[PDB]
Amino acid sequence: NTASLCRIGQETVQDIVYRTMEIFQLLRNMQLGTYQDRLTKLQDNLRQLSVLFRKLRLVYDKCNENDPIPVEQLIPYVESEERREIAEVNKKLKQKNQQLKQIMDQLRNLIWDINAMLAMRN
């Protein structure tokens, strides 16, 4: 629940950067009918950027309190039922993937046959 929060904070960081770049691009695209439309789009983008900043602050505040163990200690140099349950999902997913393989190779053969037959109908 906390690693997901860290990943969400990271993702929001990339969205913040992307939104800043998009804001600068949109300001560049403005050349003096549709001007009010661009202005409303700019207002929407700025307000959602502010909401994104608020969400990032909330995530940081939540994750800051919850370090006892430092870095560079856990790097390995040269010198219980969860596993049981996980396996079934892996096997089931693998089986599903295998089934998709049969459908895919069949559809591609069908399209190859129709291409070959239709190419020379003239």
Binding site: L93, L100, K101, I103, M104, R108, L118
Partner: protein, 39 residues
Amino acid sequence: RNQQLRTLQEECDRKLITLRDEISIDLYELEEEYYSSSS
């Protein structure tokens, strides 16, 4: 007779071409969905 036969041929060709396009679109989506899984 000739005119009727050509009209039927044209209809069949149109149906096949549209079917091929639809199947290609889906075929494209299926590969992308399948080829990006950790299995």
